[PDB]
Design a protein around this nucleic acid. Structure first.
Lengths: 81, 107, 99, 93, 79, 66, 93
DNA sequence: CGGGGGACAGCGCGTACGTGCGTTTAAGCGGTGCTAGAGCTGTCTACGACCAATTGAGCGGCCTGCAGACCGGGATTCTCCAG
DNA sequence: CTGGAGAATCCCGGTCTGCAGGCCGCTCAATTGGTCGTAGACAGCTCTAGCACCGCTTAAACGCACGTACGCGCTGTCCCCCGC
């Protein structure tokens, strides 16, 4: 598993910005977006894995993700509750 | 006498007994008062009625007979106080409000 | 005998309208799962994943990214501009408290 | 095993306000999660209130105070009215 | 009764200076007055709520501490 | 005086510990200073050295207060 | 009556790290507030964890997980080391 | 990959700022005085925990018809341009 | 201004299908009734601090004159992002 952050293609970020209400986009944005997304994903997954390990489990559940998001002040509905 | 549900006694749709059980099992306090579960059930029922009413209005506006997460998101975000309450909540498959800034409009 | 091309920006407005009404995910699922597993590799090996978990990460990340894009658009407009600059993103994240 | 939820009561309220409106499963779970979250918020605030005042009981007064603290304006007022009405009805009957 | 005008422009200027602000428009002062007023309502409402639930008539500093804490603004040095 | 005047549309005849008043002043001043610094950053981003209320509005909007 | 605090223990810690540095009352008041804040954060997170796994007991493992979740990086590592060492020493003693 | 239109650099200006001095004010300090109300104490009583027996509401499993999704083809709208 | 032209979108039948919702058996969690212990509701007492007042004092706010630099409008250039 190497070089997957390039998997987020430029059209994907373009669609994300269009949903975000962005009309004109600079070309040197996408790598910054990828870095920020990587930071966010790392922060969430760290706590998710911490929860999974404290339960002595080997698979990560969505419910662990729910707790991790809740502890970071980002509550998500519709994934088990 | 025959058993009469406390929800019926207070005329509510939500299970007061289950609420009291959860209150006792939540380590919230040593003892739980008699009327507190009723109060909480009433509040939950009222809030549920509010959100469901707005979601149904939105779904009928979209001309569908079932409420989907999109209608829920629209109802929550369009209401000022509901959006204030759910300010830090992410709704799965909720989409976004179709808002466009004026300066980007073609002139 | 003309290509009949639209002016720069109207297509952008049309796709903004398109994507502000939809709710589906905008990212390919397989690359996102691969990246998620790659990131998780650095915390614990041989980790298995429920699919609902990966969907949860995808939804949360896309929502957060949309919010950040909306804030960045306001920041750039405050600079009386139309194109988004990375400095706008940096300022927005700093103001949010993430920096 | 068996898991419980608020699905039946939510469906009852939906039929009460919009008798001709259906609901999808995902939306139904969304309401379930929403109810759970509100429950946790009110319960935690009530527990903090009780601990601050050095009390052993969670009464309806604490629930009302937590509702006032956690709800914005008109929502808080209407919820307080509903809770008081339900408490009065249950006490009388 | 216009205690909002008790917040004179020298105090606003001083706060901006501590905030690292060099040049200030003249329209700023009233904006700060309004924002500060909004903040004060938000805090004081909860403070009074706590004071009343304790069945008291005098607002204590601990009430303000709790109100600030529940708003995400933790304060130390007062209990 | 401003605090006492504000503390009238919720309840009447409210007595105050001094410590509450000073804690309110501390919190208010800290919040105002942080808002000022954010406003300064916003104005600088607009290639300016002078802050005008639209900067405050944008700062509070991004902060989520709006 | 009498109110307890952390003044003596913080004073001893200060004398260990800076055996000559004094301190003002406002500083140790802030110290006690910070100590209480951290205590409540960790204890609440530990209780949340225990309820998450359907367990009635709070052990040192729960506190270790809570500290790992609440403290960033090197602080978390060092605190884990301190807690482990103290636990081992107390058990051996 | 063509190209337009947006980013940006540079310049004029006039005014809304900053800066300093004379003036008025009200904040701050110290003192006196009063009492409302916080805080503490004894009591008992009503209310909540707890347990035994009962049962029916709600959860699990099954099934189904229709809401909604998916085609396709005209109908209608929106935008661009040459006049 | 203003028709055409072309592309984009809407809409209305027509068809299929997964799940929303209803039905059913069962069981365990809610209910009912009775016991008992004890938390707090309540009355009563104390005395602290919060409120109000007054008189000085002086630092700070205020008003104002004045001058300049900066925010803003305008213009020309080019490059780079968009439509395809």
């Amino acid at each position: 598993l190497r070089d997957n952050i390039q998997g987020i293609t430029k059209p994907a970020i373009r669609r994300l910005a269009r949903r975000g209400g962005v009309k004109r986009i600079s070309g040197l944005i996408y790598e910054e977006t990828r870095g920020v997304l990587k930071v966010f994903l790392e922060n969430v997954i760290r706590d998710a894995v911490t929860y999974t390990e404290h339960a002595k489990r080997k698979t990560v559940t969505a419910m662990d993700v729910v707790y991790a998001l809740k502890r970071q002040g980002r509550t998500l509905y519709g994934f088990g509750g | 006498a025959k058993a009469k549900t406390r929800s019926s006694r207070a005329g509510l749709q939500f299970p007061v007994g289950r609420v009291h059980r959860l209150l006792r099992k939540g380590n919230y306090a040593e003892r739980v008062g008699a009327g507190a579960p009723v109060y909480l059930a009433a509040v939950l029922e009222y809030l549920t009625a509010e959100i469901l009413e707005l979601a149904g209005n939105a779904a009928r506006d979209n001309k569908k007979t079932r409420i989907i997460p999109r209608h829920l998101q629209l109802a929550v975000r369009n209401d000022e106080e509901l959006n204030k309450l759910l300010g830090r909540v992410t709704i799965a498959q909720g989409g976004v409000l179709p808002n466009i800034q004026s300066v980007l409009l073609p002139k | 005998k003309k290509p009949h091309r639209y002016r720069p920006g109207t297509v952008a407005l049309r796709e903004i309208r398109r994507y502000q009404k939809s709710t589906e995910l905008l990212i390919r699922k397989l690359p996102f799962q691969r990246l998620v597993r790659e990131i998780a590799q650095d915390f614990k090996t041989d980790l298995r994943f429920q699919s609902s978990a990966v969907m949860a990460l995808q939804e949360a990340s896309e929502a957060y990214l949309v919010a950040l894009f909306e804030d960045t658009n306001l920041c750039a407009i405050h600079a009386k501009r139309v194109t988004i600059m990375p400095k706008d993103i940096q300022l927005a994240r700093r103001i949010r408290g993430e920096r | 095993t068996r898991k419980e939820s608020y699905a039946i009561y939510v469906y009852k309220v939906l039929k009460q306000v919009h008798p001709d409106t259906g609901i999808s499963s995902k939306a139904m779970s969304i309401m379930n999660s929403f109810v759970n979250d509100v429950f946790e918020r009110i319960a935690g605030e009530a527990s903090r209130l009780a601990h601050y005042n050095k009390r052993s009981t969670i009464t309806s007064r604490e629930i009302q105070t937590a509702v006032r603290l956690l709800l914005p304006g008109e929502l808080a007022k209407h919820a307080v009215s509903e809770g008081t009405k339900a408490v009065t009805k249950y006490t009388s009957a």
